[PDB]
Each structure stands twice: as C-alpha cells, then as structure tokens.
Amino acid sequence: LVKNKCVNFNFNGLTGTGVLTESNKKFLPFQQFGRDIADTTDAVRDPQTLEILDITPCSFGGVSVITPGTNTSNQVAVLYQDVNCTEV
Amino acid sequence: FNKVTMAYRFNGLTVLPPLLTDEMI
C-alpha cells in the first residue's frame, strides 16, 4: 500500500483510481465504504490492517495558453488550472 | 458572507475561480 501518490487501487473488489492518504474520519466497525454527497466513493478501510484512507481524483484542471498576440511574440505562458505544481 | 454559503471536480465539473477576488470586489 502506498500513500499520497496517485495509484489505481482495488480494495476487496472495490476498484478506483485516486490519491490514497491517511484520514481522520472514523468508521463504524462493520462498515466498508465511506461515501460523499454524490454517492461517489470517498473514504475506504484497508482490510489487511484497518485504517481509514481518503480518496481524491487525479488532478485535472484545464490547460490554458496565455499569449500575447502571435503578432507580438511566439512565446506563451502555460497555465495549468487548479493543480499543485508537482505532477507537471 | 456568513449567511450565504472536488465533489463535482472528480468527474469534470471544474469550478473556475471568478476573475475578481472578493477582496477586490
């Protein structure tokens, strides 16, 4: 098991791709999946050792090319929207 | 601001930031 690094995970038949992290949300013992308002999978419990893992989509955001007119320059500054600067 | 108040970002619905921050408004 790996943390804070986007993986493609299967937990006890539950499949999903996200960023598995430590999490403070506390399950009831019999429970399996945490969820969210969208019914989308949110938190999970590691079966081999019980621990509450969050999930998170990959990153996404749109690419945006900031440019002066091609009449001025051919240089552009790329904006990656709504991401943290690592995965670049 | 008290009265008024990745869920949709998981799929694709990305809530872009309004050009003008509230502090500018």
């Binding site: 308002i37 969208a38 989308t40 | 009265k3 008024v4 949709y8 799929n11 619905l13």
Partner: protein, 48 residues
Amino acid sequence: QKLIANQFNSAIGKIQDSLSSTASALGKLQDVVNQNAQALNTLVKQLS
C-alpha cells in the same frame, strides 16, 4: 441636520439585525447558489 443624522444612523443599525436576525433576506442570492449546486448534483447523479 442633527435630527436627520440620528434617523440615518438608527436606520443603519436596524439593517444589521434585518440581516442578522433573518436568513431569508438573501434568498435571491441563496437561490442562485443552490440552483447551480442543484443541477450539478443532478448532472452528477445522471452518471449512475
């Protein structure tokens, strides 16, 4: 002037409580924000 001063100030004060003591004054805004978050929920639930 002095009178109009007080009427103004005492009018401003009640604007606080008009907002402070009732949450329905902002419904117009609150409705906009909800309907946006509304359709998004609906749009998401359509995936399932």
